[PDB]
Each structure stands twice: as structure tokens, then as C-alpha cells.
UniProtKB/Swiss-Prot annotation, chain A:
It is found in: Cytoplasm, Cytosol. This is Eukaryotic translation initiation factor 2 subunit 3. Residues 66-70 are annotated as: G2. Residues 38-45 are annotated as: G1. It catalyses: GTP + H2O = GDP + phosphate + H(+). The gene is EIF2S3.
UniProtKB/Swiss-Prot annotation, chain B:
Transmembrane segments: none annotated. Phosphorylated on serine and threonine residues by GSK3B; phosphorylation inhibits its function. Residues 456-629 form the W2 domain. This is Translation initiation factor eIF2B subunit epsilon. PANTHER family: TRANSLATION INITIATION FACTOR EIF-2B SUBUNIT EPSILON (PTHR45887:SF1). Component of the translation initiation factor 2B (eIF2B) complex which is a heterodecamer of two sets of five different subunits: alpha, beta, gamma, delta and epsilon. Subunits alpha, beta and delta comprise a regulatory subcomplex and subunits epsilon and gamma comprise a catalytic subcomplex. Within the complex, the hexameric regulatory complex resides at the center, with the two heterodimeric catalytic subcomplexes bound on opposite sides. The gene is EIF2B5. CDD domains: eIF-2B_epsilon_N (cd04197), LbH_eIF2B_epsilon (cd05787), W2_eIF2B_epsilon (cd11558). Its main location: cytoplasm. SMART domains: eIF5C. It is found in: Cytoplasm, Cytosol. Residues 406-429 are annotated as: Disordered. Activated by the chemical integrated stress response (ISR) inhibitor ISRIB which stimulates guanine nucleotide exchange factor activity for both phosphorylated and unphosphorylated eIF2.
Amino acid sequence: GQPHLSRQDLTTLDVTKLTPLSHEVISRQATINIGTIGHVAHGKSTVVKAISGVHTVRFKNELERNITIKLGYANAKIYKLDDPSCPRPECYRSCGSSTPDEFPTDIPGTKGNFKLVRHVSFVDCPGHDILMATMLNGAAVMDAALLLIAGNESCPQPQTSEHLAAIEIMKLKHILILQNKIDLVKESQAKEQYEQILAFVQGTVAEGAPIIPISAQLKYNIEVVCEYIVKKIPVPPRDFTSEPRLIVIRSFDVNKPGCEVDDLKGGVAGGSILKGVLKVGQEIEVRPGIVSKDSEGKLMCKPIFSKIVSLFAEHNDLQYAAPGGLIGVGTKIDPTLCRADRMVGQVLGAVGALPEIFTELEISYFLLRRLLGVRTEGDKKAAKVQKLSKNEVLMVNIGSLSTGGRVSAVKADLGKIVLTNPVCTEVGEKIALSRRVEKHWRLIGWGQIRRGVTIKPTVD
Amino acid sequence: EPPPPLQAVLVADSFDRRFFPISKDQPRVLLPLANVALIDYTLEFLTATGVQETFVFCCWKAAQIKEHLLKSKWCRPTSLNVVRIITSELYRSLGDVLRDVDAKALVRSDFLLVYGDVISNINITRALEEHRLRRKLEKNVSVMTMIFKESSPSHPTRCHEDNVVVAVDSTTNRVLHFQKTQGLRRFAFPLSLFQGSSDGVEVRYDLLDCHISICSPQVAQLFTDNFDYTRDDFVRGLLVNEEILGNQIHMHVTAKEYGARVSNLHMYSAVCADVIRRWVYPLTPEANFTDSTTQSCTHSRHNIYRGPEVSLGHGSILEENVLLGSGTVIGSNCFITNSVIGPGCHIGDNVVLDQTYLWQGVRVAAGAQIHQSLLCDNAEVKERVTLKPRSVLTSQVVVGPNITLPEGSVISLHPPDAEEDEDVKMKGYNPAEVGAAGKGYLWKAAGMNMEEEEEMDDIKVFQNEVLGTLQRGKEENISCDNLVLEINSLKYAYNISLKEVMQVLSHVVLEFPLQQMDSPLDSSRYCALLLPLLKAWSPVFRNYIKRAADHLEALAAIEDFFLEHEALGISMAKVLMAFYQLEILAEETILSWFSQRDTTDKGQQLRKNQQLQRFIQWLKEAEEESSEDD
């Protein structure tokens, strides 16, 4: 629906032929996810801003909810110069997602038009909710990592151990290390910092990883990062054949105040696609949909049936959506149900192809006992993780589906969790747990859904 | 754009057991204060302040609350305050109620948040106007305005449980810090309050918490976002997290208007005394604000309210602050002062009542002396009975003749702790405490706790943390991968190099059987104890020690451990072939261990000991037998 980009046609579309490196899909939306495991004040946001430019966000709410939990995404197109005269990594260039598939060279590289290679999405969180977001479910949250260490400090900083513990627990095999803020660092200082870094990562998953030094503010050696994304990062395997599923992360009401009747639109639901391809005009079911209570106070759920009016990927308009980024499905649902992120925590998929709606879970949890990679300074009990107690509110994080939960009973290691709102899942899924230590939610263990109380979705 | 009609969210459940065991048979909001239910006081306050829609959320005994509300003045078609009752059994806190409010989208603009036990005559118009002006000037910044009342810290309506201290920016009436002073003798205020405001950071201890709030829908939104949240939790979280979210809480202080919350029996007594003495005017007992025919009375001198059909015995003296319910019969030569007596009561002759509250149907026999005691519905007191201060008799409780119940005594028809522990063996009414024909059980400090009774070489810590972690792993059958997770996390946290990693690993593993061991040091028993630890925990060794020359480091650690523990030297082999059988060490490493003798003299005799001669021969015997396997 937008010019200067590869045409998308539903008729000339086959799910089996679709691959993560397909030019048609990459031309409009990102296909792979590379979470940046860094830290604020160290260039965590600056690196992503330099790589992917500056975004504008098509739809934004007046009030931001769960800003410390939201899994932010940032799309970046990486291109390669076809002229062999231009030396690497200058042939590799990063830019925004709105650029055309080919643009003429802006450098004196003796001609040669740049061609789109890949489209990446940076899974960045203001905290560490990434850990229990992706630590046992797996799904397709990401397949790479960007461990960031600044240069002014000396490795290992007290904020580094948690990052390495996160890299280990995520079971990520593809990690790239970016030494930021090394511009104001002497050569000997940089060398000794690199030596400390390799000593710290000795015997860990970050053994065979690049230690690329970059300067985010001045945009130095970003092309090296793009090159290692091209080469070091392998193509993840994705399943485009199954019925599509999307975990709803955002939700907007796009109708401006004082708009005409003919200009009314449905509810736009942003989210992440796990497995399948969404098509415009496809009948979709959102579960648990409308959750209400009886006169006596009994939970009941009515799944919301609708049709995909349109699909958006950042500023681009799509005809079919594939996993590998934040896709916003504009639908026919009433804006009342999708205003101010009121549909977050729901699963949107093909009709009759959604998991069961649970209100309570019976999980087999393995409780952690010290916070991962934390320095216990003074207070030895601060890093200790207490045992689960009755009437304690945890944070169950099934993949990207966040939900609260009150522990009702623990026998030996089988804990019953009463969710605040019913969620769609299946028996045997890997879930994680979090606890409010102070000012934050911190991972304290994981488990499996042995059993659970389900609720029958009433349909009229 | 006029704002919609003012709405109120009334929480009819206290979500705690501060009135146990009186709340076992009656909800708190239905307890009669001056012969009028508390929820009636709250509804009258809401209607007077200009609330047009009220949502009453009932969880505990919601049927009784609904039944009482349907007959009330505010459930009539002529009422300008439409009362809608929402009931659910899944309510456990005010957080649940506000989350349900957000889920139902009941409120569109600023509303009133109060509990069902708030007695007040405050007109909220000024505070509401200030709140709306603040939200207009700064968009979506101020989210809540709490109502406070000026009071001295020594006032009887300020119990230590609900006492609060507030650090406030006096220029804008903004709450910067909120703390509860229960059990404290020194109040601590973070220095972060003195960041922007260099003039007004008034620390106020003269504020009485009215438990009335003007809340925007952002309050419900934040309660939904933070599913772990009571109101105090919300206030503390908002004040702490002001950096992440730029939300603010302001306060409004009233000096000429009354407002309080009946959260315990002490507050109940204080608020009842204030109500009787017209401190909450026009909510006075004779005003008949409930519009009920049985709750009308005439107000004579000395704040004496007398109902209809009240018979007073000859010689009886009502001193002051006495409210008599309709149909009460009082005997001769009685002395009643500062007491509230419900309708249908029967008082004998020569009865002294001082600061006591008798509810509906209480019968008191002649000669009783009651001071600062609460007698719930249909309670009975026999002759020659003395009730010491702070004595509570719940519903259908009879106290036998010739007793003197001590201070703090609570007698209820429910067993004291039977069902409390059970949360079958009918226990007889003990006449030693309730007397003959006495029905009830003494309720001790089990429920009295909230009744009417009040006024570096960081390698060593690495070693011991690893030891503890593996102890817990042994106790809980923790999988090898989870164990490796734990030691890896410790290694990154404390920044320990790999060499030290397997040094400490072998060190702790080898002393693990010795932690529970005395010193009848038997090599065979030591090996028997160590073998399950070696075989079950072998993957840790396999995945932690593998490369080149690390096996030599592990062997050096073993040599050091056993040179310290010489008495187990017989089980050199019992350790070496055990480490071999699990592929922890290879043939080349074990052969090169004794190839050089740079160690001390003892190490040499650790290579040629009594069992070490045979095992050093076996070190090549296995080499020549390796043709058969591996």
C-alpha cells in the first residue's frame, strides 16, 4: 500500500515458500529479533538509535502503562553494497525501515547501488523482563543478543554480572559484544578493558564472540556490527505454515476526538507473531476477549471474533504479516474494547486455533535461591530468594504474555497460582516467575503447567 | 465541557480481621454507631457532599449488606444518590475492588474513594475543585487527593495503629512522603524530599487520616498495572516510583469539619463519643438522617437524646452524653453516663453504666456495674456482675451471676481458637469464667491482639556460598543443570576466575562429607559417603573441568585437601578411581601427576603410600588394559 517498496500480493503468496530471508517480507517488516542486553547510561538506547535511526511510532497512547515492563521494538534495515571495490565493512550499512529497497551510494565507492539484505528488530526492555520473558518458553522472542559494555568503567562493573547471567539463562548461542563509549578511552585503557572482558567471559557462552569497539554517539564502527549481524548471526528457523498466533502487547484507539462517523475505525492491536502468517481479511478470534463477572461474581469469557482490516509494521503497510517484529493488526473490534492498552494479555489467532483459557494454574516450580549475577554488598539476605508463601503475588510470564498471580497453596513443589485475569495457554508450557524485590520485578524461578482450572468460553 | 455527575466507590468490606470475633456474625459496615449503621453514615456523607452515583462493593456477608441497603433511604426512587451494589466472592483487598472498577470502566472522571466505616460531615466541593484545577493546569500529573483533618497527636481519635506522618510541600499541598508511625520512636525521612523545594518541606504529625480520597481513573489504571497492590501500598509505590512515572499525590486539610474512620474498637468508641457530642453536626442522633421511624429522638440538656416509648425509673440519673433507643426500659436508681443504649434494651435497678455501648436487645440485670464495655445484640448480664473496662460480649452471650470479668475480656458464642486453628468436640461453657447459665467462651490474646486493648577476601564467601548451594541441591534433588546455573551465577557475581572456580569446586566437594563427620576417620565409610555425591554430581565436574591442564589444577586441589586430611590417606585410591570412573580425569593427567615431585615431602609419601604403591602400579595396569576398553 506504500510506494518505493516491494509489492505484496495475497494471491501471489504461498506459506510454504516463505522463508526468513524472503525479499518480499524483509522489504516491509523485520524477520529476525536481536535483543540488546545492555544498561541505561551506558549507551543501551543510543546504540539502537544510531543503528535504526529515529522512530516516530504510528499510534501512541496519551498514557503509557507498564513502561518498565513493555518490550520495545526497533526495526532496522541492513544493506550490502554490491561493488567489490568498496572495502568491508563499509559496504554494509544500517538505516530505517522506510527506506526503499535500493538507493544509490552516498560515498565515493566508485558507483554501486545498495541492495536490501536483512531487516532486524531490536527487543529492548527498560530492565530485565526479557529474562523471564524468554527464559523457558523459548518461542521466537529472539535468536541473537547484543551484550553492551561501556568503556569509561572497568570490567566487570557491578551491572555486568547480571547481564552475563542473563545471557547464560536465555540459552542464547549467538551473542555479539559491543564496547561502547570507548571514544574517550586511551588505547592502553581499552586494551586492559578488553583483557578484563575476556577474563570475565572466559568459560562462558561469550567465549567465541566479537568484542567490537563502537562509539554510538559518533556512529563509529556500526558497519562492523552490521557485518557481524550478516555473517555471525545465523538465519533462525521459523514456522510459517501453522495457524497464526499473536500475543497482544499494545492496543490503541485511533479515532481522534470530534471525528466524523464515516471516519470511525476499529481497534488497532499491536503484538508479536509466534507461528504462522496473518492475512488481510482473515477471520480472527481474540481470547479470552470480553471477561466479565456474573451477578454473584462468577468469571465468564466471550472471545472476540473480528476480521483483519489492515496490517502495519512501524510506518509500513502490509498485506501479510510474518513473525519477526511488532505487527499492529487494525481490526473491526469496537474501539471501546481496545482503548488505552485494554486488550494487552490476550491471544489473537485463527478461528478455532487457540489454546485453552485458564484461571488457575498448578505448576511444578523450581525456585531460584540467589538473584542471577548480583553482588551481595553488605546485606547478605538481600540477594537471598525466600521460599514461596501463601497469598503472595508473583508475576507469571508465559513468553510475552504477562499476568499476575496469587499463590494459593504449595504442597512440596506443586504451587497453585490464581491468575488475576484468565489467560490462554496449554497444559505443559514452560512458565517463569517474578517477585517484587524492590522497585522492580526480578526472576525467582520457573516451572511447568502440570494442570489447571479452565473456563468454558461462552459464544452467542 | 461540564464534568459528569460525581461518583463514589464505597468499599463495604474491610478486608481484615480488626473486629474479630464480632465480625463472625455481622459485617463491620452494619455495626450500629449511635444506633445507626456505619454504612448509613458513609452514604449520608456521600449524598450530602453531592455524590449522584455510588458503587457499593461487598464481599464478606454481602447478602446482609444488600438486604440492609435495599430498605435504606438511599435505595428509594426519590434519592438523588443512586446506589448500585456489586458483590463478589473474589475480593481480598481494595486492590481487587479497584481492579474490578477499572475492568468494568465504571468511572469516567474523578470519583470518591471511601470505606464503608467513614463518619464525616466534610463538604468535598473545595477539595474537588482544587483537584480538578490541578489536573487542568498539569495534565495527568496529580492522580489522587487525600483528605486529612487537623488534630493534636494526643486526641483520643488518633490510635497508634492508624497514626501517620506526612512530609508535604506546603506551597502546593503536595504529599512528598507518607509513613505510618505504629511501633516507632524515631521517624526517618529520606533526603530525596529536599531536592526541588528548598523552602517548604513541612513535616506534619498533626494530620488525622479521614480515609477519604478524590481519585482519578488513573488510580484504577495503576492498580491494574501493579497487581501486587491497599491504599497505603499504592501511596508508597507512587511516592517511591515518581522517577519512572511522573504521578503525584496531593492532600487537602480541613479544620472546621469532622472526618474519621472506625477501623477498631478504640476508634469506634472515640467516634461514637464525638457523634453523641455533636462533633459531626448535622449528623446528630436527633436529626434522623436515616429517615427511620425507630431512630428518632429528642435532644434535651447535657446532650441527652431520648427516644419514644422510653420509660425511666424513679430516681434514675442520666448525667450527660446519653442516647436512649426507642422502647428502652430503665429501672430505678440507675446511673447512666456517656453511654449509648440501643432500642429494646432492658436495664435493671441500681445499674451503673459508664462509657458503655449496649446494642439492640441487651438485657442487664439489677446491680450490674459496666464501664467502657461493649454489649452486642441480645447479650444478657445477670445479677452481681461487674464488667471491667474494655470488655466485649458478642451476640447472644450471657454472663452468669456473681462474676467480675477482668479488663480486656471478650466472650463470644464461637469457640476461642477451635475454628481459628481449623481454618466436632463441643466444648462446654466453663462456669469458672462465664458463670452458671453463662453461654460463651473466653477469647484470649489469640484474637485480643487487635481488640479493644491499647494505649574481605571474597574467596571464602564464595566457598561457603557454594557449600550452602550444594547442600540445598542435595536436600532438594536439584538437577545438575540447575546446579551449574547456580555456581555460574555465583562466579559471575563475585568475579572469580576459572582456575579458582574448579579449585573451590573440588575443595568444597571433598570436604562435603566431612561437614557432618566426626573424627573416627574411616576410609571405607568416607568413600561410601562420598560415592553418591560423586556419581550424582558428576556432570558438574564433567562440564566444569574440560580443556587442558585444568585436570592438573583439580589434582593439585585434591592433593592439598588430602595433605590437610592425612588420616584418610588409605582412601587415596577410593577417590582416584572414583574420579576416573566418571571421566573427571584422564590417564595422561593422572600419570603426569606423580611424574614431577616438586611438592613437599608429604606429597612424595602421598605418591608411594601403602595403598599408593598398588594404585601407582594400577596407573599403568589400566594403561595396558586400555586395549580392551576406552
